[PDB]
């Protein structure tokens, strides 16, 4: 279909604004470091500077919207299961209770620009929920992402 709507650029635009506390228009290594440092990790500035210059053509030292967009929009694979499997579950199970509640999945859903219905909501979670307990456990999630059948 290849729809692609403002909802895509908006999501990225919102995140970008987050990185640029001083909404200057372009993220700087320093600002980027501050955000990364406050991300529960502190990578070496070496790879950070090299990584930034790697994508940034004119390697001006700052990532422009066009660069940020393509940067992420382009890179979208995995290379790390425990990362995607955990990162996703972490988002779904906001409260991190070990189970995905309809309400939690409801937001993570519409929050993406989708108006579901009572019927869809039921089958939405009820389908993944093998125990029909109106909730999905991490175990069920992994299996659902694996076999899927």
């Amino acid at each position: 279909a290849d729809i692609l709507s403002e909802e895509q650029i908006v999501d990225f635009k919102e995140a970008f604004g987050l990185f640029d506390k001083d909404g200057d228009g372009c993220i700087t290594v320093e600002e980027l470091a501050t955000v990364i440092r406050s991300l529960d990790q502190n990578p070496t500035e070496e790879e950070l500077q090299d990584m930034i210059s790697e994508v940034d053509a004119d390697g001006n030292g700052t990532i422009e919207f066009d660069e940020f967009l393509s940067l992420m929009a382009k890179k979208v694979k995995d290379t790390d299961a425990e990362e995607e499997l955990k990162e996703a579950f972490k988002v779904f199970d906001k409260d991190q209770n070990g189970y995905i509640s309809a309400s939690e999945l409801r937001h993570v859903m519409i929050n993406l620009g989708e108006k579901l219905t009572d019927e869809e909501v039921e089958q939405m979670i009820k389908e993944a929920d093998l125990d029909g307990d109106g909730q999905v456990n991490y175990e069920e999630f992994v299996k659902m992402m694996m076999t899927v059948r």
């Binding site: 991300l39 940067l71 290379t79 993944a128």
Partner: peptide
């Protein structure tokens, strides 16, 4: 409903509010 389920995960990957790419590096 397996489609929407994957869509939610796929969309989340695109959104990456944590920056899987940058966060990883």
């Amino acid at each position: 409903a397996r489609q929407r389920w994957r869509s939610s995960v796929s969309i989340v990957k695109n959104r990456a509010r944590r920056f899987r790419m940058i966060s990883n590096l």
